[PDB]
Amino acid sequence: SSLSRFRGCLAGALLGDCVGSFYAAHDTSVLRHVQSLALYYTDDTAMARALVQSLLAKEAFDEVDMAHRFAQEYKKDPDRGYGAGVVTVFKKLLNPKCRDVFEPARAQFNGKGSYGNGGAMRVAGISLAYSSVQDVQKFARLSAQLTHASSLGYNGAILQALAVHLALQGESSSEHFLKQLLGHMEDLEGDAQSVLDARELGMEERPYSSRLKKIGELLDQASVTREEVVSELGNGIAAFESVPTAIYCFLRCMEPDPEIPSAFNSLQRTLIYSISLGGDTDTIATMAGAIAGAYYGMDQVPESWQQSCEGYEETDILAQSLHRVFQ
Amino acid sequence: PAKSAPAP
Ligand SMILES: *[C@H]1O[C@H](COP(=O)(O)OP(=O)(O)OC[C@H]2O[C@@H](n3cnc4c(N)ncnc43)[C@H](O)[C@@H]2O)[C@@H](O)[C@H]1O
Ligand SMILES: [Mg+2]
Ligand SMILES: [Mg+2]
C-alpha cells in the first residue's frame, strides 16, 4: 500500500541483484565488503525494469509491448548475464518474422518451455500494479509466459508475485504467510497443465507445494545448516530450486541469527543469509530482497547500499510511478 | 550450471 513499500520492494530487488551478482563473480568476507560501502545490475534488474516500464507505458499488462521491451533491452545490452536458453526467445522476437509473441517461449526446450527462474526474477512489479490476488496470479503467469511457457517456470513466477503481494499487506506470522502461499500453490499444482508438465520432466508432482511444506518443517527446527537448506530447497537456476529458497530466507530472517551481527537490520540479514546459500545468488537474493523490501519498506534499505547500486535513481522513480498510476 | 553470472 504505502509508497515506502513500493520503493523498498524495488530497491530490495536491486540490492539482491547487485550484491548477489558481486558475490557470484568474486569467490565474514561478505559482512566486511557490504560494510565497506558502483555495483552493476544484471538481467534480473534489466528485465524487471522493462516489465515495470511496460506496465507504466500501457497502464496495464500488454504482452506485445512487454515482449518488445524485453527484446529491445536484450539488444541494447546482451551481456548482462541472461540464461543461455532465454536468449533464443529474444532473438526470435527481434527478427522481422510475423508471429504470436508467446510462440517463441512455447517452442523452448523441444516445446516443453523453460522452468528457469527468469520469469520469477523480474515479476515483483506485477504485485505493485495489481492489488487483486486473482490479477496477481493472472498477470504473473502471462508476464512469465513471454519467456517461460513451462508451468514449472510460470508457477514459480506466480509464487514470487504472491509472496510480494502478501508482504505488501504488512505484519504476518510466518505460519499465516506460508499457509496462504501453500493454499494457492496446492490449487495451481493440481491443474492439468501443472500435472502434465511435472510428469513429462520425470519430476515429483507439486514441487512448489512440497517445498513450501519443507519450509514449514525447516522453520520449526531449532537450527538448520545452509547445506540442509540447499539440499531440501535448492539454490539453482530452476524456478523450483530458487523461489521457495528466497521465501525461506525471508521467513527465517524475521528472527536474529547468531552468525549475522545484530548491527544488520532484518532486510540486510535477509540479503546476507540468501547470498550465504551460494548458487544462483543474484536471482535468489533479488527475489528475497523484493519480498523483504515490500515487507520492511524503505526504512530498512540502507542509503549507503542503495546508492552503491547502478540505476537506483531510476528504480526509485519507477517505484513512485507505479504507486501514482496503480495505487 | 549452479548459476548464471555475466562473463568476467
Ligand atoms: C541466469 O540464469 C538464470 C535463469 O534465467 P532464465 O530462466 O531466464 O534462463 P533459461 O530459460 O535459459 O533457464 C535456465 C536454464 O534452465 C535449464 N532449463 C530450463 N528449462 C528447461 C527444460 N525444459 N529442459 C531442460 N533444461 C531446462 C537450461 O539449462 C536453461 O538454460 C538467472 O539467474 C539468470 O540471471
Ligand atoms: Mg542475473
Ligand atoms: Mg543468475
mmCIF file with all atom_site columns, all heavy atoms in Angstrom, chain A residues 125-145:
data_model
loop_
_atom_site.group_PDB
_atom_site.id
_atom_site.type_symbol
_atom_site.label_atom_id
_atom_site.label_alt_id
_atom_site.label_comp_id
_atom_site.label_asym_id
_atom_site.label_entity_id
_atom_site.label_seq_id
_atom_site.pdbx_PDB_ins_code
_atom_site.Cartn_x
_atom_site.Cartn_y
_atom_site.Cartn_z
_atom_site.occupancy
_atom_site.B_iso_or_equiv
_atom_site.pdbx_formal_charge
_atom_site.auth_seq_id
_atom_site.auth_comp_id
_atom_site.auth_asym_id
_atom_site.auth_atom_id
_atom_site.pdbx_PDB_model_num
ATOM 1   N N   . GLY A 1 125 ? 7.057   -6.285  -9.899  1.00 0.00 ? 125 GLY A N   1
ATOM 2   C CA  . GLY A 1 125 ? 6.274   -5.185  -10.477 1.00 0.00 ? 125 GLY A CA  1
ATOM 3   C C   . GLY A 1 125 ? 4.805   -5.517  -10.687 1.00 0.00 ? 125 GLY A C   1
ATOM 4   O O   . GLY A 1 125 ? 3.933   -4.614  -10.517 1.00 0.00 ? 125 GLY A O   1
ATOM 5   N N   . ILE A 1 126 ? 4.498   -6.759  -11.022 1.00 0.00 ? 126 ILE A N   1
ATOM 6   C CA  . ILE A 1 126 ? 3.083   -7.203  -11.211 1.00 0.00 ? 126 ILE A CA  1
ATOM 7   C C   . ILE A 1 126 ? 2.310   -6.967  -9.911  1.00 0.00 ? 126 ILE A C   1
ATOM 8   O O   . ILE A 1 126 ? 1.146   -6.506  -9.973  1.00 0.00 ? 126 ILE A O   1
ATOM 9   C CB  . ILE A 1 126 ? 3.008   -8.678  -11.649 1.00 0.00 ? 126 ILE A CB  1
ATOM 10  C CG1 . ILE A 1 126 ? 3.672   -8.889  -13.019 1.00 0.00 ? 126 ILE A CG1 1
ATOM 11  C CG2 . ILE A 1 126 ? 1.566   -9.154  -11.638 1.00 0.00 ? 126 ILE A CG2 1
ATOM 12  C CD1 . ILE A 1 126 ? 3.001   -8.189  -14.181 1.00 0.00 ? 126 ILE A CD1 1
ATOM 13  N N   . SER A 1 127 ? 2.910   -7.289  -8.770  1.00 0.00 ? 127 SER A N   1
ATOM 14  C CA  . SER A 1 127 ? 2.196   -7.199  -7.473  1.00 0.00 ? 127 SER A CA  1
ATOM 15  C C   . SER A 1 127 ? 2.135   -5.741  -6.994  1.00 0.00 ? 127 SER A C   1
ATOM 16  O O   . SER A 1 127 ? 1.350   -5.470  -6.070  1.00 0.00 ? 127 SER A O   1
ATOM 17  C CB  . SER A 1 127 ? 2.806   -8.095  -6.465  1.00 0.00 ? 127 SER A CB  1
ATOM 18  O OG  . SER A 1 127 ? 2.684   -9.438  -6.882  1.00 0.00 ? 127 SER A OG  1
ATOM 19  N N   . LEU A 1 128 ? 2.900   -4.841  -7.602  1.00 0.00 ? 128 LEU A N   1
ATOM 20  C CA  . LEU A 1 128 ? 2.780   -3.387  -7.332  1.00 0.00 ? 128 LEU A CA  1
ATOM 21  C C   . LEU A 1 128 ? 1.662   -2.788  -8.217  1.00 0.00 ? 128 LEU A C   1
ATOM 22  O O   . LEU A 1 128 ? 1.065   -1.798  -7.816  1.00 0.00 ? 128 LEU A O   1
ATOM 23  C CB  . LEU A 1 128 ? 4.126   -2.691  -7.576  1.00 0.00 ? 128 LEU A CB  1
ATOM 24  C CG  . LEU A 1 128 ? 5.297   -3.170  -6.694  1.00 0.00 ? 128 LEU A CG  1
ATOM 25  C CD1 . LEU A 1 128 ? 6.511   -2.272  -6.796  1.00 0.00 ? 128 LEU A CD1 1
ATOM 26  C CD2 . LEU A 1 128 ? 4.930   -3.255  -5.245  1.00 0.00 ? 128 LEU A CD2 1
ATOM 27  N N   . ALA A 1 129 ? 1.412   -3.342  -9.403  1.00 0.00 ? 129 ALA A N   1
ATOM 28  C CA  . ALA A 1 129 ? 0.444   -2.791  -10.372 1.00 0.00 ? 129 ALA A CA  1
ATOM 29  C C   . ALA A 1 129 ? -0.958  -3.335  -10.053 1.00 0.00 ? 129 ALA A C   1
ATOM 30  O O   . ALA A 1 129 ? -1.903  -2.574  -10.219 1.00 0.00 ? 129 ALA A O   1
ATOM 31  C CB  . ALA A 1 129 ? 0.842   -3.060  -11.798 1.00 0.00 ? 129 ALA A CB  1
ATOM 32  N N   . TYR A 1 130 ? -1.080  -4.590  -9.627  1.00 0.00 ? 130 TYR A N   1
ATOM 33  C CA  . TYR A 1 130 ? -2.377  -5.299  -9.478  1.00 0.00 ? 130 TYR A CA  1
ATOM 34  C C   . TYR A 1 130 ? -2.597  -5.596  -7.995  1.00 0.00 ? 130 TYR A C   1
ATOM 35  O O   . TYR A 1 130 ? -1.797  -6.309  -7.369  1.00 0.00 ? 130 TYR A O   1
ATOM 36  C CB  . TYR A 1 130 ? -2.393  -6.560  -10.344 1.00 0.00 ? 130 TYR A CB  1
ATOM 37  C CG  . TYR A 1 130 ? -2.445  -6.271  -11.824 1.00 0.00 ? 130 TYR A CG  1
ATOM 38  C CD1 . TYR A 1 130 ? -1.302  -6.239  -12.604 1.00 0.00 ? 130 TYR A CD1 1
ATOM 39  C CD2 . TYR A 1 130 ? -3.645  -5.971  -12.447 1.00 0.00 ? 130 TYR A CD2 1
ATOM 40  C CE1 . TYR A 1 130 ? -1.346  -5.932  -13.957 1.00 0.00 ? 130 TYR A CE1 1
ATOM 41  C CE2 . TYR A 1 130 ? -3.706  -5.686  -13.803 1.00 0.00 ? 130 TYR A CE2 1
ATOM 42  C CZ  . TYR A 1 130 ? -2.554  -5.661  -14.565 1.00 0.00 ? 130 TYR A CZ  1
ATOM 43  O OH  . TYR A 1 130 ? -2.641  -5.379  -15.901 1.00 0.00 ? 130 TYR A OH  1
ATOM 44  N N   . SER A 1 131 ? -3.696  -5.110  -7.425  1.00 0.00 ? 131 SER A N   1
ATOM 45  C CA  . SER A 1 131 ? -3.963  -5.280  -5.976  1.00 0.00 ? 131 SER A CA  1
ATOM 46  C C   . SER A 1 131 ? -4.727  -6.583  -5.721  1.00 0.00 ? 131 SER A C   1
ATOM 47  O O   . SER A 1 131 ? -4.618  -7.153  -4.632  1.00 0.00 ? 131 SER A O   1
ATOM 48  C CB  . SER A 1 131 ? -4.689  -4.067  -5.424  1.00 0.00 ? 131 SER A CB  1
ATOM 49  O OG  . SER A 1 131 ? -5.884  -3.877  -6.138  1.00 0.00 ? 131 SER A OG  1
ATOM 50  N N   . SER A 1 132 ? -5.491  -7.061  -6.682  1.00 0.00 ? 132 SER A N   1
ATOM 51  C CA  . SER A 1 132 ? -6.323  -8.278  -6.523  1.00 0.00 ? 132 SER A CA  1
ATOM 52  C C   . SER A 1 132 ? -5.443  -9.537  -6.679  1.00 0.00 ? 132 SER A C   1
ATOM 53  O O   . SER A 1 132 ? -4.662  -9.606  -7.641  1.00 0.00 ? 132 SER A O   1
ATOM 54  C CB  . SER A 1 132 ? -7.457  -8.241  -7.505  1.00 0.00 ? 132 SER A CB  1
ATOM 55  O OG  . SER A 1 132 ? -7.660  -9.517  -8.069  1.00 0.00 ? 132 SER A OG  1
ATOM 56  N N   . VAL A 1 133 ? -5.589  -10.515 -5.786  1.00 0.00 ? 133 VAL A N   1
ATOM 57  C CA  . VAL A 1 133 ? -4.787  -11.769 -5.799  1.00 0.00 ? 133 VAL A CA  1
ATOM 58  C C   . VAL A 1 133 ? -5.058  -12.533 -7.107  1.00 0.00 ? 133 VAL A C   1
ATOM 59  O O   . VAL A 1 133 ? -4.113  -13.151 -7.648  1.00 0.00 ? 133 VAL A O   1
ATOM 60  C CB  . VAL A 1 133 ? -5.037  -12.597 -4.524  1.00 0.00 ? 133 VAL A CB  1
ATOM 61  C CG1 . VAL A 1 133 ? -6.391  -13.280 -4.528  1.00 0.00 ? 133 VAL A CG1 1
ATOM 62  C CG2 . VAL A 1 133 ? -3.940  -13.625 -4.257  1.00 0.00 ? 133 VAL A CG2 1
ATOM 63  N N   . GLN A 1 134 ? -6.274  -12.454 -7.652  1.00 0.00 ? 134 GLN A N   1
ATOM 64  C CA  . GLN A 1 134 ? -6.633  -13.087 -8.941  1.00 0.00 ? 134 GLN A CA  1
ATOM 65  C C   . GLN A 1 134 ? -5.836  -12.445 -10.079 1.00 0.00 ? 134 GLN A C   1
ATOM 66  O O   . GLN A 1 134 ? -5.365  -13.189 -10.947 1.00 0.00 ? 134 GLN A O   1
ATOM 67  C CB  . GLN A 1 134 ? -8.131  -12.953 -9.230  1.00 0.00 ? 134 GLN A CB  1
ATOM 68  C CG  . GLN A 1 134 ? -8.988  -13.764 -8.259  1.00 0.00 ? 134 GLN A CG  1
ATOM 69  C CD  . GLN A 1 134 ? -9.391  -13.036 -6.994  1.00 0.00 ? 134 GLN A CD  1
ATOM 70  O OE1 . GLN A 1 134 ? -8.927  -11.934 -6.632  1.00 0.00 ? 134 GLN A OE1 1
ATOM 71  N NE2 . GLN A 1 134 ? -10.345 -13.652 -6.310  1.00 0.00 ? 134 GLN A NE2 1
ATOM 72  N N   . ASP A 1 135 ? -5.746  -11.117 -10.116 1.00 0.00 ? 135 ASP A N   1
ATOM 73  C CA  . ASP A 1 135 ? -4.969  -10.391 -11.156 1.00 0.00 ? 135 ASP A CA  1
ATOM 74  C C   . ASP A 1 135 ? -3.462  -10.657 -10.981 1.00 0.00 ? 135 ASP A C   1
ATOM 75  O O   . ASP A 1 135 ? -2.762  -10.766 -11.991 1.00 0.00 ? 135 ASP A O   1
ATOM 76  C CB  . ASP A 1 135 ? -5.231  -8.883  -11.150 1.00 0.00 ? 135 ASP A CB  1
ATOM 77  C CG  . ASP A 1 135 ? -6.552  -8.476  -11.763 1.00 0.00 ? 135 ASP A CG  1
ATOM 78  O OD1 . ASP A 1 135 ? -7.143  -9.302  -12.500 1.00 0.00 ? 135 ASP A OD1 1
ATOM 79  O OD2 . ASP A 1 135 ? -6.990  -7.352  -11.462 1.00 0.00 ? 135 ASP A OD2 1
ATOM 80  N N   . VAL A 1 136 ? -2.986  -10.713 -9.744  1.00 0.00 ? 136 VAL A N   1
ATOM 81  C CA  . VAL A 1 136 ? -1.549  -11.012 -9.459  1.00 0.00 ? 136 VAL A CA  1
ATOM 82  C C   . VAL A 1 136 ? -1.197  -12.366 -10.103 1.00 0.00 ? 136 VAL A C   1
ATOM 83  O O   . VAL A 1 136 ? -0.232  -12.420 -10.861 1.00 0.00 ? 136 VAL A O   1
ATOM 84  C CB  . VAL A 1 136 ? -1.253  -11.006 -7.953  1.00 0.00 ? 136 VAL A CB  1
ATOM 85  C CG1 . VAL A 1 136 ? 0.098   -11.650 -7.672  1.00 0.00 ? 136 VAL A CG1 1
ATOM 86  C CG2 . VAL A 1 136 ? -1.326  -9.599  -7.378  1.00 0.00 ? 136 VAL A CG2 1
ATOM 87  N N   . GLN A 1 137 ? -2.017  -13.397 -9.881  1.00 0.00 ? 137 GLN A N   1
ATOM 88  C CA  . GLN A 1 137 ? -1.795  -14.745 -10.475 1.00 0.00 ? 137 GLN A CA  1
ATOM 89  C C   . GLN A 1 137 ? -1.885  -14.682 -12.004 1.00 0.00 ? 137 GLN A C   1
ATOM 90  O O   . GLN A 1 137 ? -1.006  -15.208 -12.679 1.00 0.00 ? 137 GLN A O   1
ATOM 91  C CB  . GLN A 1 137 ? -2.778  -15.755 -9.908  1.00 0.00 ? 137 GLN A CB  1
ATOM 92  C CG  . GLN A 1 137 ? -2.562  -16.013 -8.425  1.00 0.00 ? 137 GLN A CG  1
ATOM 93  C CD  . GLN A 1 137 ? -3.634  -16.921 -7.876  1.00 0.00 ? 137 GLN A CD  1
ATOM 94  O OE1 . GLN A 1 137 ? -3.578  -18.153 -8.056  1.00 0.00 ? 137 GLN A OE1 1
ATOM 95  N NE2 . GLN A 1 137 ? -4.597  -16.279 -7.226  1.00 0.00 ? 137 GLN A NE2 1
ATOM 96  N N   . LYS A 1 138 ? -2.918  -14.046 -12.532 1.00 0.00 ? 138 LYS A N   1
ATOM 97  C CA  . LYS A 1 138 ? -3.178  -13.982 -13.987 1.00 0.00 ? 138 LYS A CA  1
ATOM 98  C C   . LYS A 1 138 ? -2.001  -13.303 -14.703 1.00 0.00 ? 138 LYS A C   1
ATOM 99  O O   . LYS A 1 138 ? -1.497  -13.845 -15.708 1.00 0.00 ? 138 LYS A O   1
ATOM 100 C CB  . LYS A 1 138 ? -4.486  -13.251 -14.241 1.00 0.00 ? 138 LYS A CB  1
ATOM 101 C CG  . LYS A 1 138 ? -4.793  -13.032 -15.708 1.00 0.00 ? 138 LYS A CG  1
ATOM 102 C CD  . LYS A 1 138 ? -6.095  -12.326 -15.941 1.00 0.00 ? 138 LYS A CD  1
ATOM 103 C CE  . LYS A 1 138 ? -6.252  -12.039 -17.413 1.00 0.00 ? 138 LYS A CE  1
ATOM 104 N NZ  . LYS A 1 138 ? -7.503  -11.304 -17.688 1.00 0.00 ? 138 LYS A NZ  1
ATOM 105 N N   . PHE A 1 139 ? -1.565  -12.148 -14.219 1.00 0.00 ? 139 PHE A N   1
ATOM 106 C CA  . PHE A 1 139 ? -0.561  -11.327 -14.925 1.00 0.00 ? 139 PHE A CA  1
ATOM 107 C C   . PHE A 1 139 ? 0.858   -11.758 -14.556 1.00 0.00 ? 139 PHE A C   1
ATOM 108 O O   . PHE A 1 139 ? 1.732   -11.580 -15.411 1.00 0.00 ? 139 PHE A O   1
ATOM 109 C CB  . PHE A 1 139 ? -0.905  -9.852  -14.771 1.00 0.00 ? 139 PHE A CB  1
ATOM 110 C CG  . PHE A 1 139 ? -2.190  -9.491  -15.466 1.00 0.00 ? 139 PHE A CG  1
ATOM 111 C CD1 . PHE A 1 139 ? -3.283  -9.023  -14.754 1.00 0.00 ? 139 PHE A CD1 1
ATOM 112 C CD2 . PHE A 1 139 ? -2.302  -9.615  -16.838 1.00 0.00 ? 139 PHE A CD2 1
ATOM 113 C CE1 . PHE A 1 139 ? -4.461  -8.685  -15.407 1.00 0.00 ? 139 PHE A CE1 1
ATOM 114 C CE2 . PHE A 1 139 ? -3.488  -9.278  -17.484 1.00 0.00 ? 139 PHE A CE2 1
ATOM 115 C CZ  . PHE A 1 139 ? -4.569  -8.831  -16.768 1.00 0.00 ? 139 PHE A CZ  1
ATOM 116 N N   . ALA A 1 140 ? 1.088   -12.359 -13.389 1.00 0.00 ? 140 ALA A N   1
ATOM 117 C CA  . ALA A 1 140 ? 2.388   -13.008 -13.120 1.00 0.00 ? 140 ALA A CA  1
ATOM 118 C C   . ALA A 1 140 ? 2.546   -14.156 -14.129 1.00 0.00 ? 140 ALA A C   1
ATOM 119 O O   . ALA A 1 140 ? 3.612   -14.273 -14.734 1.00 0.00 ? 140 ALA A O   1
ATOM 120 C CB  . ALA A 1 140 ? 2.489   -13.508 -11.698 1.00 0.00 ? 140 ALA A CB  1
ATOM 121 N N   . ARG A 1 141 ? 1.485   -14.947 -14.339 1.00 0.00 ? 141 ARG A N   1
ATOM 122 C CA  . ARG A 1 141 ? 1.531   -16.075 -15.303 1.00 0.00 ? 141 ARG A CA  1
ATOM 123 C C   . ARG A 1 141 ? 1.835   -15.516 -16.709 1.00 0.00 ? 141 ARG A C   1
ATOM 124 O O   . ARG A 1 141 ? 2.785   -15.994 -17.346 1.00 0.00 ? 141 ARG A O   1
ATOM 125 C CB  . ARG A 1 141 ? 0.234   -16.875 -15.281 1.00 0.00 ? 141 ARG A CB  1
ATOM 126 C CG  . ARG A 1 141 ? 0.279   -18.085 -16.215 1.00 0.00 ? 141 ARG A CG  1
ATOM 127 C CD  . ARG A 1 141 ? -0.969  -18.903 -16.285 1.00 0.00 ? 141 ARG A CD  1
ATOM 128 N NE  . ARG A 1 141 ? -1.246  -19.509 -14.987 1.00 0.00 ? 141 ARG A NE  1
ATOM 129 C CZ  . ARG A 1 141 ? -2.228  -19.124 -14.160 1.00 0.00 ? 141 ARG A CZ  1
ATOM 130 N NH1 . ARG A 1 141 ? -2.965  -18.061 -14.425 1.00 0.00 ? 141 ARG A NH1 1
ATOM 131 N NH2 . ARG A 1 141 ? -2.436  -19.809 -13.044 1.00 0.00 ? 141 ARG A NH2 1
ATOM 132 N N   . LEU A 1 142 ? 1.060   -14.540 -17.185 1.00 0.00 ? 142 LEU A N   1
ATOM 133 C CA  . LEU A 1 142 ? 1.186   -14.050 -18.580 1.00 0.00 ? 142 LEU A CA  1
ATOM 134 C C   . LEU A 1 142 ? 2.543   -13.381 -18.782 1.00 0.00 ? 142 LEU A C   1
ATOM 135 O O   . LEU A 1 142 ? 3.174   -13.623 -19.824 1.00 0.00 ? 142 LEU A O   1
ATOM 136 C CB  . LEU A 1 142 ? 0.045   -13.086 -18.909 1.00 0.00 ? 142 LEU A CB  1
ATOM 137 C CG  . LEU A 1 142 ? -1.308  -13.749 -19.189 1.00 0.00 ? 142 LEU A CG  1
ATOM 138 C CD1 . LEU A 1 142 ? -2.447  -12.764 -19.105 1.00 0.00 ? 142 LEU A CD1 1
ATOM 139 C CD2 . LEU A 1 142 ? -1.310  -14.385 -20.558 1.00 0.00 ? 142 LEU A CD2 1
ATOM 140 N N   . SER A 1 143 ? 2.996   -12.560 -17.836 1.00 0.00 ? 143 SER A N   1
ATOM 141 C CA  . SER A 1 143 ? 4.321   -11.898 -17.960 1.00 0.00 ? 143 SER A CA  1
ATOM 142 C C   . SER A 1 143 ? 5.405   -12.984 -18.026 1.00 0.00 ? 143 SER A C   1
ATOM 143 O O   . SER A 1 143 ? 6.337   -12.833 -18.821 1.00 0.00 ? 143 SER A O   1
ATOM 144 C CB  . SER A 1 143 ? 4.581   -10.893 -16.866 1.00 0.00 ? 143 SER A CB  1
ATOM 145 O OG  . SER A 1 143 ? 4.739   -11.509 -15.587 1.00 0.00 ? 143 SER A OG  1
ATOM 146 N N   . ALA A 1 144 ? 5.315   -14.022 -17.199 1.00 0.00 ? 144 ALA A N   1
ATOM 147 C CA  . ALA A 1 144 ? 6.296   -15.133 -17.198 1.00 0.00 ? 144 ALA A CA  1
ATOM 148 C C   . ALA A 1 144 ? 6.276   -15.872 -18.552 1.00 0.00 ? 144 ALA A C   1
ATOM 149 O O   . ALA A 1 144 ? 7.362   -16.184 -19.071 1.00 0.00 ? 144 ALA A O   1
ATOM 150 C CB  . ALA A 1 144 ? 6.020   -16.073 -16.058 1.00 0.00 ? 144 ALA A CB  1
ATOM 151 N N   . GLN A 1 145 ? 5.079   -16.109 -19.120 1.00 0.00 ? 145 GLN A N   1
ATOM 152 C CA  . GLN A 1 145 ? 4.901   -16.931 -20.333 1.00 0.00 ? 145 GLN A CA  1
ATOM 153 C C   . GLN A 1 145 ? 5.543   -16.264 -21.547 1.00 0.00 ? 145 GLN A C   1
ATOM 154 O O   . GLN A 1 145 ? 5.721   -16.981 -22.538 1.00 0.00 ? 145 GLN A O   1
ATOM 155 C CB  . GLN A 1 145 ? 3.422   -17.220 -20.576 1.00 0.00 ? 145 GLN A CB  1
ATOM 156 C CG  . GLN A 1 145 ? 2.865   -18.275 -19.637 1.00 0.00 ? 145 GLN A CG  1
ATOM 157 C CD  . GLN A 1 145 ? 1.358   -18.374 -19.725 1.00 0.00 ? 145 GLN A CD  1
ATOM 158 O OE1 . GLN A 1 145 ? 0.650   -17.380 -19.693 1.00 0.00 ? 145 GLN A OE1 1
ATOM 159 N NE2 . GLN A 1 145 ? 0.853   -19.601 -19.790 1.00 0.00 ? 145 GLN A NE2 1
#
